[PDB]
């Protein structure tokens, strides 16, 4: 989709001209932050389900009804209960993406689009996840720069969820 | 478009899976020969006059009955569109170099120039002895070892020889 990349050799094809030296000095930074983001990337992808099964609870346990209050968009029901936990996943699939590729440009055109009018129709509590972004974002266990990052994408998500 | 971290994740996404470990290297090691894949956009971009210029002095010598009266490049006006033809595709070769991914240069370049040449009536076989030449002599210059930190580049070289070779056949 969109990274610091595209996003410079988009500027340069939009004015039908090479490359700047600015957006080469661009991608240089992109490459020198990548290190931090990337291993973060790795260690948050290795520990998806602590983290998912975790955040499932900290929702399941704030807003209690999920669990009883018979209804589609509920977690009361074996069917509900994947699905709530589909959705969790998701979406921390997604801030490792922006990661790997060093910008937002992932969830924007995966999740972060249309966002509205999904939680909308199918009557989903943005609180409901603003939630358990929360609980990664402080059981990432994550330092240095390498939670820098993560809890950069992680408020980016918050931010469109609210 | 996509560049070689958008591909990766975007096919990690269809099957809707995280990173293996292969797949994170594979990316890692990328930005470690960061600084090659930038001398190189940089040293290509800065001599595309050049290169072109050359390719073109090349291709017209091997293939002169393009500038005989009729011949496709004849006349001022043909040979400027064609050098400017040239230019264009190098210009979207840097760009997937950069981008380590061929994405952008068959999107906004490759896809249907080989009608668009038919069509003109233009040889899309002469078309790829240009570009051909355009990587040889980018090669050249991108891969020189004066002026630069010894180290080695035939897999980007090799990685580079590929774009233009790609765009070669899209139009033959
Ligand atoms: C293969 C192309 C040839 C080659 C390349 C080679 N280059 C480097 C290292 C560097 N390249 C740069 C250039 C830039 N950095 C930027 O941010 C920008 C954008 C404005 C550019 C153009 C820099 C700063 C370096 C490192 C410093 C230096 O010059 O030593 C290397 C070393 C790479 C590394 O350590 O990662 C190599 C091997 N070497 C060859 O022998 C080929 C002809
Ligand atoms: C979990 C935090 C809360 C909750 C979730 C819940 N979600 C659904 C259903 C859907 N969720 C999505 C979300 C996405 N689809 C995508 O393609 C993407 C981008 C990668 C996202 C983020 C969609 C489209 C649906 C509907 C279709 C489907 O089944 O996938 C449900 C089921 C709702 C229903 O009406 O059947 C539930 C229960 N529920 C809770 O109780 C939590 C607080
Ligand atoms: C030079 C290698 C050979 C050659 C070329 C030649 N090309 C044209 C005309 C066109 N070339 C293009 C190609 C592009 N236009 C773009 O915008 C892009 C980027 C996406 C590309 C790749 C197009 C669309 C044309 C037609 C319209 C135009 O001029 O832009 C000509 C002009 C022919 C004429 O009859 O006017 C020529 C001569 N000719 C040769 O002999 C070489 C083998």
């Known amino acids: ?162 | 478009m996509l560049d070689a971290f958008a591909k990766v994740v975007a096919q990690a996404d269809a099957r809707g899976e995280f990173l293996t470990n292969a797949q994170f290297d594979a990316l890692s090691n990328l930005v470690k020969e960061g600084n090659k894949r930038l001398d190189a956009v940089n040293r290509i971009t800065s001599n595309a006059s050049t290169i072109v210029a050359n390719a073109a002095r090349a291709l017209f010598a091997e293939q002169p009955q393009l500038i005989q009266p009729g011949g496709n490049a004849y006349t001022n006006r043909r040979m400027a569109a064609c050098l400017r033809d040239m230019e264009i595709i190098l210009r979207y070769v840097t760009y997937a170099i950069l981008a380590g991914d061929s994405s952008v240069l068959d999107d906004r370049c490759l896809n249907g120039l080989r009608e668009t040449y038919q069509a003109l009536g233009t040889p899309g076989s002469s078309v790829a002895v240009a570009i051909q030449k355009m990587k040889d002599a980018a090669i050249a210059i991108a891969n020189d070892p004066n002026g630069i930190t010894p180290g080695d580049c035939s897999a980007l070289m090799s990685e580079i020889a590929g774009y233009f070779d790609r765009a070669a056949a899209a139009v033959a």
């Open chain 1, 1 to 162: 989709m969109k990274t610091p990349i595209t996003e410079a050799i988009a500027a340069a094809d939009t004015q039908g001209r090479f490359l700047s030296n600015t957006e080469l000095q661009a991608v240089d930074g992109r490459f020198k932050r990548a290190v931090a983001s990337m291993e973060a990337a790795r260690a948050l992808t290795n520990n998806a389900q602590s983290l998912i099964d975790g955040a499932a609870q900290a929702v399941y346990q704030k807003f209690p009804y999920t669990t009883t209050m018979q209804g589609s968009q509920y977690a009361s029901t074996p069917e509900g209960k994947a699905k709530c936990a589909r959705d969790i996943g998701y979406y921390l699939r997604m801030i490792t993406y922006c990661l790997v590729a060093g910008g937002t440009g992932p969830m924007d055109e995966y999740l972060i689009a249309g966002l509205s009018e999904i939680n909308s129709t199918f009557d989903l509590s943005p609180s409901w996840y603003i939630e358990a972004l929360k609980y990664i974002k402080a059981n990432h266990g994550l330092t240095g720069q390498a939670a820098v990052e993560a809890n950069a994408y992680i408020d980016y998500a918050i931010n469109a969820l609210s």
